[PDB]
Structures are given as C-alpha cells and as structure tokens.
Design a protein around this ligand. Sequence first.
Ligand SMILES: COc1ccc(OCCN2C[C@H]3CCC[C@@H](C2=O)N3S(=O)(=O)c2ccc3[nH]c(=O)sc3c2)cc1OC
Length: 128
Amino acid sequence: GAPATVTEQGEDITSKKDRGVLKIVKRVGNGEETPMIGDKVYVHYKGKLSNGKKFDSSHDRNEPFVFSLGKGQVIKAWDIGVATMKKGEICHLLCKPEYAYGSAGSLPKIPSNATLFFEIELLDFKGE
Ligand SMILES: COc1ccc(OCCN2C[C@H]3CCC[C@@H](C2=O)N3S(=O)(=O)c2ccc3[nH]c(=O)sc3c2)cc1OC
C-alpha cells in the first residue's frame, strides 16, 4: 500500500540525508513557489501508524490544519516536508521517529518510536 510504497520508493528530503523523511509527490501543484519560513500554511492531512491505524485526519473535522512554517509548531518532518510543497500539491511523507515524536510518542494515539505516514495537501500559504 501507500506507506510501503513511500518507504521503498520515496525520496529523502532531509538536509542530513539520513532518510528520516521520505516523500512522493502524488499531485503536482501550481508553479514553482514553495512557502517561506513564517508563512501561515493551510493543509489537509491524514496520518497513519505503521500498524495501519489512522490516528488523525483534518478532512474528518471539516477544517484545515493551520500553522506557521518553520517554527517548530509541528513535528520536524512537517516543517521540512511542507516547505518543499507547491500550492495545490498532494504528497506522501514517511517520517521516522527522530523527525516525529521520538521515544516519547504522543498520548493517546502515537506510541514510542513510531514511524508515521502522512498524506498532505497544501491548500494555501500566505505571509502575515
Ligand atoms: C516542535 O516539536 C513539536 C511541535 C508540535 C508537535 O505536535 C503538535 C503539532 N502537530 C499536530 C498534528 C498535525 C501536524 C502534524 C503533527 C504535529 O506536529 N500532529 S499529528 O498529525 O502527527 C498528531 C499527533 C497526535 C495526535 N493525537 C490526536 O489525538 S490527533 C494527533 C495528531 C510535536 C512536536 O514534537 C515534539
């Protein structure tokens, strides 16, 4: 399935090239511009654990998830991954725990040492 495919066929987008964050572009977005640090970014996403459980979805809430890019308001994989996206792009990200919740996890849904899969759609970005 999609998590296996990004694991086996994804591109390492980390600066360290430690394969901590792998990406596949599923839908090509618009133009060439990607968001900049500090931009308010609007995304839709779903997350799955490596045991197959869906742990989160913005679609199911009928509202996007909004954060300021590059400020550690989200896991490292997202700051890195969303920074690579064009407006309208949909990607898959495979996030090793060092770029996610580490040994701590995040109760109730994310265990210790969890590799996470996300589908992310970049809806919009704007500077404040
Ligand atoms: C700078 O370091 C950090 C900053 C913020 C952090 O988390 C808050 C921001 N944040 C929110 C969401 C969506 C964006 C992605 C990610 C996220 O980071 N989670 S997530 O979908 O993986 C996710 C996790 C648990 C969970 N439990 C639920 O009941 S639903 C749910 C969803 C963690 C950091 O690393 C300690």
